[PDB]
Coordinates of C-alpha atoms and ligand atoms in Angstrom, one line a residue:
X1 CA 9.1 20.3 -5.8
X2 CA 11.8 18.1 -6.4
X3 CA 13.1 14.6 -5.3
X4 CA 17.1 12.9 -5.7
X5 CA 17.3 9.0 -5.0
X6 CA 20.4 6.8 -5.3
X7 CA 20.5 4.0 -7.6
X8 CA 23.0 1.4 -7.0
X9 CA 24.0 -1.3 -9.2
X10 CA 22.6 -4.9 -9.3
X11 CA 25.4 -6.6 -9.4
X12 CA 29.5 -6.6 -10.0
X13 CA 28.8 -5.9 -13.8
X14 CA 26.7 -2.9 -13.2
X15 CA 24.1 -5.1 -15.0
X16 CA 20.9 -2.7 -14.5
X17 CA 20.9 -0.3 -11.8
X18 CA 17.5 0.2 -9.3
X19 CA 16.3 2.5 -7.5
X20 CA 13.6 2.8 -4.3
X21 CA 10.4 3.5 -4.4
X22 CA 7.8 4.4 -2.2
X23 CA 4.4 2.9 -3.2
X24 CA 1.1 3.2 -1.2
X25 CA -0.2 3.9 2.4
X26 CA 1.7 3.2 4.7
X27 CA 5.0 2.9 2.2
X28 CA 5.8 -0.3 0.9
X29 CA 9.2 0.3 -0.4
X30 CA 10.4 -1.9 -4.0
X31 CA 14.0 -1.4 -5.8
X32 CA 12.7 -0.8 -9.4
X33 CA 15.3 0.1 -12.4
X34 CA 14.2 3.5 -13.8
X35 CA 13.7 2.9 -17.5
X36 CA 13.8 5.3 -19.8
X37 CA 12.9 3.2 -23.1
X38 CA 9.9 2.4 -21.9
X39 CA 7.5 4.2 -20.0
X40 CA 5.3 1.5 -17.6
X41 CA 5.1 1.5 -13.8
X42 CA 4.8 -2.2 -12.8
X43 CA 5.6 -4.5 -10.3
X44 CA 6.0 -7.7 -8.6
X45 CA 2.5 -7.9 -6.2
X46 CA 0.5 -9.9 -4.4
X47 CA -1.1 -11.0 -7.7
X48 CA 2.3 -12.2 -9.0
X49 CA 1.8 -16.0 -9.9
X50 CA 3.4 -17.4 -7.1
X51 CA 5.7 -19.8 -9.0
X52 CA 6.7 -16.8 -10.8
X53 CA 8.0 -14.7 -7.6
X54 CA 11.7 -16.0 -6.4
X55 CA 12.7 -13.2 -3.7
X56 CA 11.7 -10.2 -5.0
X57 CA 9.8 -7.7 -3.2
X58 CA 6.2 -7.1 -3.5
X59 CA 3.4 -4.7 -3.5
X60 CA 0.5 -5.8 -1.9
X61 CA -2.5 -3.0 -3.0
X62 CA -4.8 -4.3 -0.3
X63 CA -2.3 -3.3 2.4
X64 CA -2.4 0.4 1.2
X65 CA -5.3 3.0 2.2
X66 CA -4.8 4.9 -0.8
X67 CA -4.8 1.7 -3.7
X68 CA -7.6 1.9 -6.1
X69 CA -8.4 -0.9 -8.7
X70 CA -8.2 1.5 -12.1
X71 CA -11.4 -1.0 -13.3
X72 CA -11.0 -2.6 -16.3
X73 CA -7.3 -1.5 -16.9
X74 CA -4.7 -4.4 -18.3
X75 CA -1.3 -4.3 -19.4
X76 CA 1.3 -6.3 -21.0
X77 CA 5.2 -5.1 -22.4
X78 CA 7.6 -6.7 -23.8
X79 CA 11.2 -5.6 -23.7
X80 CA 14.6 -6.1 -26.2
X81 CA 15.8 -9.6 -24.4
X82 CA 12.5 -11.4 -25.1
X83 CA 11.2 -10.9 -21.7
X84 CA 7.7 -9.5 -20.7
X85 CA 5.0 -9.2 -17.5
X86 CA 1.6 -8.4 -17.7
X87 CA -1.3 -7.7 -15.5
X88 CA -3.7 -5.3 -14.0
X89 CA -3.9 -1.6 -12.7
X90 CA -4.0 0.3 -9.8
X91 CA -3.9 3.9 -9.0
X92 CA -1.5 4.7 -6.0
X93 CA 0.7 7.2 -4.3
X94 CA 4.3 6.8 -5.4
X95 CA 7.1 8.9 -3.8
X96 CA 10.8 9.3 -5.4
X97 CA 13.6 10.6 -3.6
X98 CA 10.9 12.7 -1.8
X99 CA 8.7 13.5 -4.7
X100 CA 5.1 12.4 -4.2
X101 CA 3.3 11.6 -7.1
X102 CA -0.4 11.0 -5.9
X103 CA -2.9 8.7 -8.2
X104 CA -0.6 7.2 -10.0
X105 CA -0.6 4.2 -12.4
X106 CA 0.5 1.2 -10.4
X107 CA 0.9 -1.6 -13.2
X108 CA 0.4 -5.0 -11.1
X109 CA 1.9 -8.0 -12.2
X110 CA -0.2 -11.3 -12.8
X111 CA 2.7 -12.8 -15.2
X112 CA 6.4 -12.4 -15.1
X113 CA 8.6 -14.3 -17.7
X114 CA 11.8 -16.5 -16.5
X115 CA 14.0 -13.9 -16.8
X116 CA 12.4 -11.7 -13.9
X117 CA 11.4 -14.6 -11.9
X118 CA 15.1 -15.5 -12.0
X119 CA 16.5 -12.2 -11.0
X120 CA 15.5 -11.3 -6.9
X121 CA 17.2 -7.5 -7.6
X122 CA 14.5 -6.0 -9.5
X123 CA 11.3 -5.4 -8.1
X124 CA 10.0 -4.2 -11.5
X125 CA 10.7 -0.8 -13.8
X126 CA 9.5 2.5 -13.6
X127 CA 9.5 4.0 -17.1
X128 CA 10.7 7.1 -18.2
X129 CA 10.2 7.6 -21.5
X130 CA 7.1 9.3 -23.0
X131 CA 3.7 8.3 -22.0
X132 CA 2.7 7.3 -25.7
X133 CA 4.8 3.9 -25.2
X134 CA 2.5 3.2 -22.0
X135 CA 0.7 0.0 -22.2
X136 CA -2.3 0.2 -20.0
X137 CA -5.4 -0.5 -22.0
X138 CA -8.3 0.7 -22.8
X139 CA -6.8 4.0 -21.4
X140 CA -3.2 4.8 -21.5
X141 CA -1.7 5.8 -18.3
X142 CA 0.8 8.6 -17.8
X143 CA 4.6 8.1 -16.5
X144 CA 5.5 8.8 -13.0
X145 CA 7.6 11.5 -14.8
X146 CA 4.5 13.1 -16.6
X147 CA 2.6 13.1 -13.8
X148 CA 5.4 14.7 -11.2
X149 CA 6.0 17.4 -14.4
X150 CA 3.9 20.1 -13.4
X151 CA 4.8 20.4 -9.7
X152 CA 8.2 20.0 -10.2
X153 CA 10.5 23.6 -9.9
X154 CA 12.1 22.7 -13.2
X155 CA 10.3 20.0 -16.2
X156 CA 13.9 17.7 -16.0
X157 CA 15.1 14.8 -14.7
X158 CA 19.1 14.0 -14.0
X159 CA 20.8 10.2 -14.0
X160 CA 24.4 9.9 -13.1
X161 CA 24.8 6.4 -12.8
X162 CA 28.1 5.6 -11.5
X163 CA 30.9 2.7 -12.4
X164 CA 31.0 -0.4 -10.1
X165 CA 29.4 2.4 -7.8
X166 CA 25.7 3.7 -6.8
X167 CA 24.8 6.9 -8.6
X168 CA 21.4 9.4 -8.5
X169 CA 18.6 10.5 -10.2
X170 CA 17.0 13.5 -9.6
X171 CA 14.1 15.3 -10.4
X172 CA 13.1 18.9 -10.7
X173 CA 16.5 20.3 -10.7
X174 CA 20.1 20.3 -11.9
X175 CA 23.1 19.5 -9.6
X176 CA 25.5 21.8 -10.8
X177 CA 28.0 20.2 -8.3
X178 CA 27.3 17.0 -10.0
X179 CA 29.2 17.3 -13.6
X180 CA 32.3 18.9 -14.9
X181 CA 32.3 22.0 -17.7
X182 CA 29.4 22.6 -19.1
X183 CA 26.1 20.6 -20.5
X184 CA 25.8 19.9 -24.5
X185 CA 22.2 20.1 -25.3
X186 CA 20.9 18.2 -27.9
X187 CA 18.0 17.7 -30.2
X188 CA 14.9 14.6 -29.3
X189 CA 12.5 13.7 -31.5
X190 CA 9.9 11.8 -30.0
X191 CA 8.4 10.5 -32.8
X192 CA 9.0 6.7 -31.6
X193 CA 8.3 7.7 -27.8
X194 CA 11.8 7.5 -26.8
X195 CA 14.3 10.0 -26.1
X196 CA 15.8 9.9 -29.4
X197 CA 19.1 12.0 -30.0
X198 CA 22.0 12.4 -33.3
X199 CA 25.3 11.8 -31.6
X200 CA 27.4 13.7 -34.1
X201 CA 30.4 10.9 -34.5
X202 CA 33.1 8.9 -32.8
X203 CA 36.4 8.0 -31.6
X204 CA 38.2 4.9 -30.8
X205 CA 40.8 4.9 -28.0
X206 CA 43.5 7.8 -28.8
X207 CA 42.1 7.9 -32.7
X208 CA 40.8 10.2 -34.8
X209 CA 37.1 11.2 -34.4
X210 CA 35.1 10.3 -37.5
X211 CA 32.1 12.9 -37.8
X212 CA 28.9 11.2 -38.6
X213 CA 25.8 10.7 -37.7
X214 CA 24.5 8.5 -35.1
X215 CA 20.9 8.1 -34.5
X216 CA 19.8 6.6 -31.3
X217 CA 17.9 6.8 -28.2
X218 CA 19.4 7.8 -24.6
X219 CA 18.7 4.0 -22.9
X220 CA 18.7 3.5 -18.8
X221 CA 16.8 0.4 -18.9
X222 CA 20.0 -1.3 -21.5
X223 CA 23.0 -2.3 -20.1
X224 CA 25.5 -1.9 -23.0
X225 CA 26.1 0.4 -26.3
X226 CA 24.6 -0.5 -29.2
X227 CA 26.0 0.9 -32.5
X228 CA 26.3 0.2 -36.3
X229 CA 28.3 -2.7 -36.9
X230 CA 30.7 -0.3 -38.4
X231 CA 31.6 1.6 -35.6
X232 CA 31.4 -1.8 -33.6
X233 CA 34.2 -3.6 -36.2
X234 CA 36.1 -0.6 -35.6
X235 CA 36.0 -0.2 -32.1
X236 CA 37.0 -4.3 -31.7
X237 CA 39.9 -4.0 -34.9
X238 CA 42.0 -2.1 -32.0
X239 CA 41.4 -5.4 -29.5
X240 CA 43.9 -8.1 -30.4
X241 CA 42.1 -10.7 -30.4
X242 CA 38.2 -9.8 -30.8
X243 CA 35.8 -11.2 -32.4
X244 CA 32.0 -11.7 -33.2
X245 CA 30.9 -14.8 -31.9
X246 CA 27.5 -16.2 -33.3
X247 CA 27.7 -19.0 -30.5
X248 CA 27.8 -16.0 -27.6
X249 CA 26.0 -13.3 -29.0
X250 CA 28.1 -10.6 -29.8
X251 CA 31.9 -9.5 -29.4
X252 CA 34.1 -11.3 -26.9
X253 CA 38.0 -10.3 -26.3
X254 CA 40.3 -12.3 -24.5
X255 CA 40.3 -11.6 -20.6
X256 CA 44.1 -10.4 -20.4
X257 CA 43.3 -7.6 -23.0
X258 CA 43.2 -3.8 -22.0
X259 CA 40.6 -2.1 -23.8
X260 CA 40.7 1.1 -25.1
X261 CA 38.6 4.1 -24.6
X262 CA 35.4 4.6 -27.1
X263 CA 34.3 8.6 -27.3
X264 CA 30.7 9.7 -28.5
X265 CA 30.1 13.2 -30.0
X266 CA 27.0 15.3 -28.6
X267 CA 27.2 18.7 -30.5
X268 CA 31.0 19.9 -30.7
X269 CA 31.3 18.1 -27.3
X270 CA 32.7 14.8 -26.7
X271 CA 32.0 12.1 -23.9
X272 CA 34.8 9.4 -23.0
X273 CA 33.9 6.3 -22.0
X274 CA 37.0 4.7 -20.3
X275 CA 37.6 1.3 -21.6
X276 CA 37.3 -0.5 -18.4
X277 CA 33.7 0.3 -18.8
X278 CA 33.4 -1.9 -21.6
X279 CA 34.7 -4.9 -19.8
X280 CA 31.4 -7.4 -19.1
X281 CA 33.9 -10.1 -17.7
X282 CA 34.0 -14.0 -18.5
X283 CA 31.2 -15.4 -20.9
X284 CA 30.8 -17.7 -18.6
X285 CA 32.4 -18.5 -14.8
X286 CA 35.8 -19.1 -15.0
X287 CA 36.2 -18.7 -19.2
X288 CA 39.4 -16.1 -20.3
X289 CA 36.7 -14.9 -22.8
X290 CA 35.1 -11.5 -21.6
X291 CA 32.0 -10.0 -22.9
X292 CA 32.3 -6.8 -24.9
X293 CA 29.9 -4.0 -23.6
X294 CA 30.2 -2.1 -27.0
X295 CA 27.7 -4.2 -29.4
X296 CA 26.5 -4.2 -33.1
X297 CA 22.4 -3.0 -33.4
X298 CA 22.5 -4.5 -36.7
X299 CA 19.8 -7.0 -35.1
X300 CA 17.4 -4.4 -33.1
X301 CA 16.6 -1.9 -35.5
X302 CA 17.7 1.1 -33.7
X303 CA 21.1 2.2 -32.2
X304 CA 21.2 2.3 -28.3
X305 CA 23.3 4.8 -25.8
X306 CA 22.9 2.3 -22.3
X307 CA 24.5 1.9 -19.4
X308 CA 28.3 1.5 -20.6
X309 CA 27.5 5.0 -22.7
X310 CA 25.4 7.3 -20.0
X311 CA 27.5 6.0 -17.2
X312 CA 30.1 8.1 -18.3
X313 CA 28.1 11.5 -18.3
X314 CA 25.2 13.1 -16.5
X315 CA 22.7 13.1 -18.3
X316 CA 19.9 15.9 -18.2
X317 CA 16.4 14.9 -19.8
X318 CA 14.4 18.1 -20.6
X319 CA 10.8 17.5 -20.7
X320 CA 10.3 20.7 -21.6
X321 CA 7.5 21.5 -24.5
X322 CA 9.9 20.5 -26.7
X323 CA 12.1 18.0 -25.2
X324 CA 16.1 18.1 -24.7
X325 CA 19.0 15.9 -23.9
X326 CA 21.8 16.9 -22.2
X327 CA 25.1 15.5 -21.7
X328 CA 28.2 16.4 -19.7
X329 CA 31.5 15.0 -18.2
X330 CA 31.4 14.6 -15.0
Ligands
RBJ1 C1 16.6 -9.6 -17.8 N1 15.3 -9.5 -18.5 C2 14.2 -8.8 -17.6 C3 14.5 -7.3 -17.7 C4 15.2 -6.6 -16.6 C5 15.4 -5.3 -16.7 C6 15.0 -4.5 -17.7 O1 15.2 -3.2 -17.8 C7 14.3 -5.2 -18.8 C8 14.1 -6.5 -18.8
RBJ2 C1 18.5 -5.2 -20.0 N1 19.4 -6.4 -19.5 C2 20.2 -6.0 -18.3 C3 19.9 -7.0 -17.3 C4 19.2 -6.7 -16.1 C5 18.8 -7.7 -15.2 C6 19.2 -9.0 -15.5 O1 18.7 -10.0 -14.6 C7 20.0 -9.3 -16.6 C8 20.3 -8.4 -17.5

């Protein structure tokens, strides 16, 4: 089997990206961001504090034939920005793009923080990183991608997300329509539960790449590229202007600048990220200070290839025994 679904930006900033879902009998259809550093199904629901639920869409388990309580199951994540849900379990048929997944883990929420209560977009996250981040407790569940793995015509799945522009994920197969050249593969270690990758080095604008090596982890669910400070000070020297700002958060640049291009290494292969991608606009309506999308990790712990960087390839996860990345131009 396979199954291919567009996912289309939230917003103008290509904040997060979902994608729909088909939960439960008869469907009830929710736009959930596919999240590969983490690796929970959940949702807004019927059980969803109401005070808590400002537009979003919800899944209501007693409305489909085939929901099952999973008795005694809880879960509770939190994620990078300081936001989190929690709640109980159901087991449920999910379909993707076409691709039925039956008795799945359905992660219901009973608590949203502020953050998701303020955003109607997101329906919740469908993880799609390995099953040993899963939350559920006292039994870990599996990821819609675990479970879909065996029935699938090849153990992969595909996200091209696009630029100010809906893009796809697919499972089960590889567009070869969808990329240009050829696909780098490169080395996970799964050790953490993400899909962790060495990007061998980088370039800023028409400069010189600098070959070293760049741990990280391949990010859907994070909107912008998290590096060393390092390779952040020198990406931002070439910006007149830039600077850190402790009061914002990060590096801002005037509004007027044109930014140049950042490239990442994968093997001998290189992936350009235009500059325009790294444009996050005004700090705040109206300001002439824009948000940089290229960001130090110095703060999380780990370096993080999101949006700004896998926007610019397609992206091929092998789930394979032993899992792969693969990037390409497209
Ligand atoms: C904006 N804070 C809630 C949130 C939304 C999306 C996501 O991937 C993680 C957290
Ligand atoms: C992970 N943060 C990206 C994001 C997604 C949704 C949102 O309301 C704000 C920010």
């Amino acid at each position: 089997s396979t199954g291919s679904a567009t996912t289309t930006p939230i917003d103008s900033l290509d904040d997060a990206y979902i994608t729909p879902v088909q939960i439960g009998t008869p469907a009830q259809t929710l736009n959930l961001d596919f999240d590969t550093g983490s690796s929970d199904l959940w949702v807004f629901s019927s059980e969803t504090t109401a005070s808590e639920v400002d537009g979003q869409t919800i899944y209501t388990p007693s409305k489909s034939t085939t929901a099952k309580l999973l008795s005694g199951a809880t879960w509770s994540i939190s994620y990078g920005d300081g936001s989190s849900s929690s709640g109980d379990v159901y087991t449920d048929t999910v379909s993707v793009g076409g691709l039925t997944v039956t008795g799945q883990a359905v992660e219901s929420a009973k608590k949203v923080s502020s953050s998701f209560t303020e955003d109607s977009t997101i329906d919740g996250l469908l993880g799609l990183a390995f099953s040993t981040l899963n939350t559920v407790s006292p039994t870990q569940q599996k990821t819609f991608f675990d479970n879909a793995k065996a029935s699938l015509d090849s153990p992969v799945f595909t996200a091209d997300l696009g630029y100010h522009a809906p893009g796809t994920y697919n499972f089960g197969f590889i567009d070869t329509t969808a990329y240009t050249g050829s696909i780098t593969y490169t080395a996970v270690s799964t050790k953490q539960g993400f899909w962790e990758w060495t990007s061998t080095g980088y370039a800023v604008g028409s400069g010189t790449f600098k070959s070293t090596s760049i741990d990280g982890i391949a990010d859907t669910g994070t909107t912008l590229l998290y590096l060393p400070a390092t390779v952040v000070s020198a990406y931002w020297a070439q910006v007149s202007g830039a600077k850190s700002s402790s009061s914002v958060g990060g590096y801002v640049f005037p509004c007027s600048a044109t930014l140049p291009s950042f490239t990442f290494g994968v093997g001998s292969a290189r992936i350009v990220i235009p500059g325009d991608y790294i444009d996050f606009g005004p700090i705040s309506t109206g300001s002439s200070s824009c948000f940089g999308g290229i960001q130090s990790s110095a703060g999380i712990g780990i370096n993080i290839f999101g949006d700004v960087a896998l926007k610019a390839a397609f992206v091929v996860f092998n789930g394979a025994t032993t899992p792969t990345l693969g990037f390409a131009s497209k």
